[PDB]
């Protein structure tokens, strides 16, 4: 509870990158849900297609997947690792995706308390 929800994606996408559990993309990210093993999805409200959100909110809800609301979709390309770093630590090449799906969690508890208390409050 010491960390905010809008920054709660950061450390969990870092600790799950070491196990290759981040579905960059949209089609293969949605097909990970049809493997019935993914655990969370993030929708960026800065969107481009009205057809795009109404399918993914229909897929994640009926198969019991919650949601993390972050605004911008070029912003989500950083923590998935889809952006190339510069020499001193800046994303010199910005490539941002609008759908991020995790499959397996990292081995920690600094995010595994805050994502759980964000989960249980909307039940």
Shortest distance (Å) from residue 111 CB to other proteins:
27
Task: Tell me how far, at minimum, the Cβ of 29 lies from other proteins, in Å.
Answer: 10
Query: With binding defined as CB under 8 A, does residue 104 bind other proteins?
Result: no
Residue in 79, 83, 67, 2 with CA at minimum distance from that of residue 33: 67
Which phi and psi angles does 53 have, rounded to 5°? -80, -30
Widest pairwise Cα distance in the chain: 45
**Quick check: 5 and 114 in contact, CB under 8 A?**
yes
Count of positions on this chain that bind other proteins (CB under 8 A): 15
In the bound state with other proteins, the residue whose beta carbon lies nearer, of 27 and 122, is 27
Q: In the block, which residue shows the tokens 């998935």? A: 80
In whole angstroms, how close is the CB of 4 to other proteins at the nearest point? 31
Kindly state the smallest distance separating residue 28's Cβ from other proteins, in Å. 10
Q: Are strands 67-70 and 84-85 parallel, antiparallel or unpaired?
A: unpaired
- Range 20-79, binding other proteins (CB under 8 A): 26-27, 30-31, 34-35, 49, 51-52, 54-55, 58-59, 61-62
Cα 40 to Cα 28: distance, rounded to the nearest angstrom: 14
Binding site for other proteins (CB under 8 A): 26-27, 30-31, 34-35, 49, 51-52, 54-55, 58-59, 61-62
């Amino acid at each position: 509870g010491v960390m905010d929800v809008n920054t709660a994606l950061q450390e969990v996408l870092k600790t799950a990158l070491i196990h290759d559990g981040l579905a960059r993309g949209i089609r293969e990210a949605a097909k990970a849900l049809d493997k019935r093993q993914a655990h969370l999805c993030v929708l960026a409200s800065n969107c481009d297609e009205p057809m795009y959100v109404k399918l993914v909110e229909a897929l994640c809800a009926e198969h019991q997947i919650n949601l993390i609301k972050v605004d911008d979709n070029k912003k989500l390309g950083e923590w998935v690792g889809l952006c190339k770093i510069d020499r001193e630590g800046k994303p010199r090449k910005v490539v941002g995706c609008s759908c991020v799906v995790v499959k397996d969690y990292g081995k920690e508890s600094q995010a595994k308390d805050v994502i759980e208390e964000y989960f249980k409050c909307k039940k």
